[PDB]
Symmetry: C3
Subunit: 114 residues, 3 copies
Amino acid sequence: PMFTVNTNVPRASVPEGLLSELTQQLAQATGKPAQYIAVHVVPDQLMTFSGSSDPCALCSLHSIGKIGGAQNRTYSKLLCGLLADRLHISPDRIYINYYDMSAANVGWNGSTFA
Amino acid sequence: PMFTVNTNVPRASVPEGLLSELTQQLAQATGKPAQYIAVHVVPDQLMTFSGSSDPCALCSLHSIGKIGGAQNRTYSKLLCGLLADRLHISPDRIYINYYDMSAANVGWNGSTFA
Amino acid sequence: PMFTVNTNVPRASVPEGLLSELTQQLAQATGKPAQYIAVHVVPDQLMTFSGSSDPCALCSLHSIGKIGGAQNRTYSKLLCGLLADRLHISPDRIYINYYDMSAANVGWNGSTFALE
């Protein structure tokens, strides 16, 4: 799984160790081994929600399975709560797009997962 | 809806007003209240298009519905035109990828839209 | 096609001309004309892979066709190898997501590729 967070929160407001926390929490939440979890946090972005520059985040979770209606509700409660708390973003200014990737469409280590 | 623009045009070339203007135009094009519209502009990128470093942009519009070939022509005429003019980019060096998201695959406010 | 590379390798570690090289390599591998290929490299990123901040990359290739199980294996061998060598990244710390785009879902020049 790959989790990306783009945010207008500045880098100094991003806790050191957020990427480790996300890695461990995503391992637990998805049941996928930590070895396969990648995280990418992009602070200082020029972004708006509702046309305003108040703190916001646009995120994505890509995974080969472990994605779907009920699971994504759970993920959204976990990850909106964690980002809202850690980055001080209102949860109604966070989107998370979920992507169920086919194993044939993910390259890694010079091959694909198919 | 979520609109993302990645460009090699510098930050000083991005009008302060542009994210508000994009919000207004996307609200007209989609009918959605600003509350649901997110815009993300990423200037100063290392990019090429046709193997050249001339000004370009790579963009995405994610929307729950309201996506398809006919409708995307309307979005493309609107958004290519506006970005070309505001960012001083030739319209033939702008791509916009459209993504029709399932409501179950968009997290917001601690839940999903499903 | 569009190829994006996000990496924690610093900008100084990106060899000059890598985006030209990627353009050429993608052109030959996909059979798409270079004129339609865009490349975006995003260095200095805050990233982890397996919970470690060692060099890694997360990439995407979007293309109208030329995507599929066998093709993607060929692209992955080529692009993992090239990025590993150029950016000094272990191949087991690179993901590449592939996306087969409908022509109707790619806007370009004020229209779409389905209409061009």
